[PDB]
Design a binder for these strands. Structure first.
Ligand code: NA
Ligand code: NA
Length: 430
DNA sequence: ATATGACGCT
DNA sequence: AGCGTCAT
């Protein structure tokens, strides 16, 4: 009544760099700009695997994970940029460096959590408060929100996309409850102003565009982000949640896209997020466990407490390569040679990381996949990482996995390996 | 034959 | 420690 928490304490955004690897290649090669374009890894097998897709190409049905040969059938004029290949493996250094460029700009505006190479969560709570002070009581002009959509508006008693956007924004701002510096809706609005400014700076200083969502927590921010793309941002208010969730498939909510989300759908006989509200917290815990049940109970009401962690650097640095089909590794000599290739890239990236970020990794995780095993990893083993030395890391990696070899003759390697993965972890400040 | 990274469970 | 889950 006067006491239930409504999950409106924070202002949180999620920024997704639009088809990021494509933009990186389009910046470098202007001939690819404003065209149907994709980024592909490798080339011999069916033209290579597509890993990023321009919005012009998406309109022809081209998607990630598609074979480039198949993408060309959907989009004959598709332009392709190829991921750099180093030591016979994909090398993502150009995109990591671009990601760092963006993160350093974002950091000037608010607290950033690196979510992936192309996504960051943003905690705007303190930046909003400070901006509310500077603003004084001056009202928020629509000119400060030139790319913002207000989810759920316009509503109530013009057929162009941009006209609908401005209608909803005018309706939101007209209503906007500004006498109170503690209105959650006002705080979200100021957060959206800051994100416009942040996105403007990113585009001016790198050429890169992005989409964003602004709401009260990470899950709603991420959901908001996907509602209006590309190069747009969406504000999802607490009040918009009942209507938004009433037709929102459960699998669209972060962390419910897999087996848990499935189980929610099958056990409860529901399909939309909003249908979760009819269950008590105990009943959800009974089906899905105490933590998951409490989380679903809060989440279906728009409430989620996962903090934006102040960390722009990845916690682990890893290198992996799959060896599919007939390329699976079947000799001891192959296994050793590719462990060295992986270890040499890893030494390079670790040395750059130590100079850039004043830290050293202390543990080496070795993971492999054996042919026939659908799992990401068939086995993981760890050993100490004391020298940034490719030959020692690769030798040590072989040592900890060599006993997995089933074959009688140790010149051969059985069962064949379909993946090798080296990951450096357990960093210490250096 | 759709390269990574974070984190949960035990 | 080592495996399972979810994700970009
Ligand atoms: Na008003
Ligand atoms: Na309000």
């Amino acid at each position: 009544g006067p006491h239930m928490a409504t999950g409106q304490d924070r202002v949180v955004a999620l920024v997704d760099m639009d088809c990021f690897f494509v933009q990186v290649e389009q910046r470098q090669n202007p001939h690819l700009r404003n065209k149907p374009c994709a980024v592909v890894q490798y080339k011999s097998w069916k033209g290579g695997g597509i890993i990023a897709v321009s919005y012009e190409a998406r309109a022809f049905g081209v998607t990630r994970s598609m074979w480039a040969d198949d993408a060309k059938k959907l989009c004959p004029d598709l332009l392709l940029a190829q991921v750099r290949e180093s030591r016979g493996k994909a090398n993502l250094t150009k995109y990591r460096e671009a990601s760092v460029e963006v993160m350093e700009i974002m950091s000037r505006f608010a607290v950033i959590e690196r979510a992936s190479i192309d996504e960051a969560y943003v905690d705007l709570t303190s930046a909003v408060q400070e901006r509310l002070q500077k603003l004084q009581g001056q009202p928020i002009s629509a000119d400060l929100l030139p790319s913002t959509y207000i989810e759920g508006l316009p509503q109530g008693p013009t057929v162009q996309k941009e006209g609908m956007r401005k209608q909803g924004l005018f309706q939101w701002l007209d209503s906007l409850q500004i006498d109170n510096l503690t209105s959650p809706d006002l705080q979200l609005t100021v957060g959206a102003v800051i994100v416009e400014e942040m996105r403007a700076a990113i585009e001016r200083e790198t050429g890169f565009q992005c989409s964003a969502g602004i709401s009260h927590n990470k899950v709603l921010a991420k959901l908001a982000c996907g509602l209006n793309k590309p190069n747009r941002q969406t504000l999802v208010s607490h009040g918009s949640v009942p209507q938004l969730f009433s037709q929102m498939p459960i699998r669209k909510i972060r962390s419910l896209g897999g087996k848990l989300g499935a189980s929610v759908i099958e056990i409860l006989g529901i399909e939309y997020m909003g249908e979760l509200t009819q269950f008590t917290e105990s009943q959800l815990q009974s089906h899905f466990g105490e933590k998951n049940g409490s989380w679903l109970y809060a989440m279906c009401r728009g409430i989620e407490h996962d903090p934006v962690k102040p960390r722009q650097l990845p916690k682990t640095i890893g290198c992996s390569k799959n060896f599919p089909g007939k390329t699976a590794l079947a000799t001891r000599e192959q296994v050793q040679w590719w462990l060295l290739q992986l270890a040499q890239e890893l030494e390079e990236r670790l040395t750059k990381d130590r100079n850039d970020n004043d830290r050293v990794a202390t543990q080496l995780v070795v993971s492999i996949r054996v042919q026939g095993d659908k799992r990401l990893s068939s086995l993981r083993r760890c050993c100490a990482l004391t020298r940034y030395d490719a030959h020692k890391m690769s030798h040590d990696a072989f040592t900890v996995i060599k006993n997995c070899n089933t074959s009688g003759i140790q010149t051969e390697w059985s069962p064949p390996l379909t993946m090798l993965f080296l990951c450096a972890t357990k960093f210490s400040a250096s």
